[PDB]
């Protein structure tokens, strides 16, 4: 019922997740978009729709998980969209743009754009939502001042969550049950989790080669790695490497998201 | 008849949609038939619109960030995200309003802001000498940024050069 989805140049890959396990042999292409370099990925649990960002055109698009023909929703006034998150309740999308230096929000169909933030952003990339509690989280891999930030989804209460001991925070993910925000850092070579309520205490998993994006499914983390060219599954608590998937076509892996069977 | 793919790779062809997919692709290439270059590379591996040009990493004089994506145009090789305030097709020049040697080894002494003083600089120009960084100073004004009056001269804020 639940699937893993990841990006590569010219395509979006798909593979089943049966009880915290990747069905590697069942990995098949979800969609082929030959001219594009898909970077960010997100999934709308109510309509079962996959969203993505393309730095080639550039553009932001979407397609139903079941069959669906790919459709572009935004093309104009776009720089380098590299992360996209959704509000499945309010029916809106959020994204990072590391060229125009901003975070925008818009309707599912791409209309009624609004620049949520556009100052203090140099290299925003990872971005996630927690629609039920109304919170937005993102990473900015700013070489000089990397940071993990949070704000209300409405645009108020912006603040820095983590600033120290960060190198290249490329992606982050939020798990509603454990109230845990985790990110993968290609500079400090690790994955760190924290409770936004008690930001000071960080759980850390070491040994990550070159993480780009990450998503979560319960106690497990799934990240894409540029060094190993694989999707790596890691368990938070035991801090062990559960499994790895090397797609046959060893090209650069990008965004990653989980297609849930229900919200 | 044989798979239209490089390096003895196996392939899959769906006759209904007629699309053929190579299982593997050589390093730096991407796409169903390895017909294009992966992000971070540029070229024309199969000569789809010009002579064959094997995919090779972006050539930007080390003035691009390895952690960035879309660093160069995948067909022409044009550098798109030059850092250290550099610019140009190969990140071989400084952006407008900056000076220095973009090809310098140390990023610190590459392209720095001219930071010309608006009172002591001719016509309030923001550009400066490409090597020395010297802004075009008004009469009796000295200093790289034109922010200091020559000894024996005063009132830089006159906007006409220091006077006495």
- Which single residue is written with the structure tokens 């790695």? A225
At residue B157, what are phi and psi to the nearest 5 degrees? -65, 0
Residue B126 to residue B135: CA distance in whole angstroms: 8
Nearest-by-Cβ selection for A80 from B21, B27, B70: B70
CA of A154 to nearest chain B CA: how many angstroms apart?
A: 29
Beta bridge partners of A181: A174, A194
CB distance A3 to A258 below 8 Å: yes
Q: Are A27 and A13 in contact (CB under 8 A)?
A: yes
Distance CA A213, CA A204 (A): 17
What is the maximum alpha-carbon separation in chain B? 90
- Could you tell me the two tokens for A209? 């080669």
Looking at beta carbons, which residues of chain B come within 8 Å of A82?
69
Resolution for this model in angstroms, one decimal place? 2.3
> How far lies B121's CA from each of A15, A153, B117, B125, in Å?
63, 46, 6, 6
Q: Does B108 touch chain A (CB under 8 A)?
A: no
**Which residues are B79's β-sheet partners?**
B72
> Which among A254, A122, A257, A168 is positioned nearest to B69, based on CA atoms?
A254
| Tokens read off for A7 | 């990006």
Contact B40 A252 (CB under 8 A): yes
Separation of alpha carbons A169 and A147, rounded Å:
7
Measured at the CA of A65, the angle between CA A60 and CA A66, to 5 degrees, comes to 140
Chain B interface, best mutation among A9, A58, A78, by max B CB count within 10 A: A9
Contact: B24, A250; criterion CB under 8 Å: yes
**Distances, alpha carbon A252 to alpha carbons A36, A210, A217, B46, in Å:** 13, 11, 23, 20
Residues of B in contact with A250 (CB under 8 A): 24-25, 27
- The whole-angstrom distance between residue A183's C-alpha and the CA centroid of its chain comes to 10
- Token code pair at residue B3: 């798979």
Query: CB contact, 8 Å: B10 with chain A?
Result: no
Q: Between A and B, how many CB-CB pairs are < 8 A?
A: 57
The nearest alpha carbon in chain A to B28 belongs to A251
B27 to chain A: which residues are within 8 Å by CB?
Answer: 250
- Contact assessment for residue A96 and residue A106, using Cβ atoms and an 8 Å cutoff: no
Chain A CB contacts of B32 below 8 Å: 10, 32, 34
SS3 state at A217: strand
Residues of chain A numbered 5-44 and touching chain B (CB < 8 Å): 8-10, 29, 32, 34, 37, 39
Per-residue CA distances from A18 to A132, A176, A195 (Å) = 26, 21, 28
A10–B30: do the CB atoms touch at under 8 Å?
yes
What chain B holds in terms of domains, given with CATH numbers, is 3-55 (2.10.25.10), 56-111 (2.10.25.10), 112-164 (2.10.25.10)
Q: Which domains does chain A have, with CATH numbers?
A: 1-263 (2.120.10.30)
Closest residue, chain B, to A169 (C-alpha)? B67
CB under 8 A, 24+ apart: contacts of A109-115: A109/A73, A110/A60, A110/A73, A110/A74, A113/A74
Taking CA–CA distances from B84, the nearest residue in chain A reads A143
Task: Provide the 10 A C-beta neighbour count for residue B148.
Answer: 16
Method: X-ray
Between chains, do B31 and A123 touch, taking CB under 8 Å as contact?
Answer: no
Question: Any CB–CB contact under 8 A between A257 and chain B?
Answer: no
Contact A123 B68 (CB under 8 A): yes
CA distance A113 to chain B (A): 24
Residue A127 vs residues A144, B10, B87, B114: alpha-carbon distances, Å: 20, 38, 29, 36
């Amino acid at each position: 019922g639940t699937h893993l989805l990841f990006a590569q140049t010219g395509k979006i890959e798909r593979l089943p997740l049966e009880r915290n396990t990747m069905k590697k042999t069942e990995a098949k292409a979800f969609l082929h978009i030959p001219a594009k370099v898909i970077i960010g990925l997100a999934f709308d649990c109510v309509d079962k729709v996959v969203y993505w960002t393309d730095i080639s055109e550039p553009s932001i698009g979407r397609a139903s998980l079941h069959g669906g023909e790919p459709t572009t929703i935004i093309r104009q006034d776009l720089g380098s969209p590299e992360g996209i998150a959704l509000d499945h309740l309010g029916r809106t999308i959020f994204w990072t743009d590391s060229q125009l230096d901003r975070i925008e929000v818009a309707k599912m169909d791409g209309t009624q754009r609004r620049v949520l933030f556009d100052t203090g952003l140099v290299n925003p990339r990872g971005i996630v939502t927690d629609p039920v509690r109304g919170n937005l989280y993102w990473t900015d891999w700013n070489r000089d001042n990397p940071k993990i930030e949070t704000s209300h989804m409405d645009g108020t209460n912006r603040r820095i969550l983590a600033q120290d001991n960060l190198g290249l925070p490329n992606g982050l993910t939020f798990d509603a049950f454990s109230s845990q925000l985790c990110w993968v850092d290609a500079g400090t070579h690790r994955a760190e989790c924290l409770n936004p309520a008690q930001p000071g205490r960080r759980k850390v998993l070491e040994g990550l080669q070159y993480p780009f994006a990450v998503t979560s499914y319960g106690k497990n983390l799934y990240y894409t790695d540029w060094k190993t060219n694989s999707v790596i599954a890691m368990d938070l608590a035991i801090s062990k490497e559960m499994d790895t998937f090397h797609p046959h076509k060893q090209t650069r892996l990008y965004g990653i998201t989980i297609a849930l069977s229900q919200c | 008849q044989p798979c239209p793919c490089p390096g003895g790779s196996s392939c899959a062809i769906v006759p209904k949609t007629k699309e053929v997919v190579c299982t593997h692709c050589p390093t730096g290439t991407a796409g169903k038939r390895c017909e294009l270059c992966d992000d971070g590379y540029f070229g024309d591996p199969l000569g789809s619109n010009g002579p064959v040009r094997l995919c090779r990493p972006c050539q930007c004089n080390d003035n691009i960030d390895p952690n960035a994506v879309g660093n160069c145009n995948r067909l022409t090789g044009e550098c798109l995200k030059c850092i250290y305030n550099t610019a140009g097709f190969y990140c071989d020049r400084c952006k407008e309003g900056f000076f220095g040697n973009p090809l310098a080894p140390n990023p610190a002494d590459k392209c720095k802001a001219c930071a010309c003083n608006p009172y002591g600089t001719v016509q309030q120009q923001s550009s400066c000498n490409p090597v020395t960084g010297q802004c075009q100073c008004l009469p009796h004004v000295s200093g790289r940024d034109c922010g200091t009056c020559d000894p024996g001269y005063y009132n830089l804020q006159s906007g006409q050069g220091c006077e006495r």
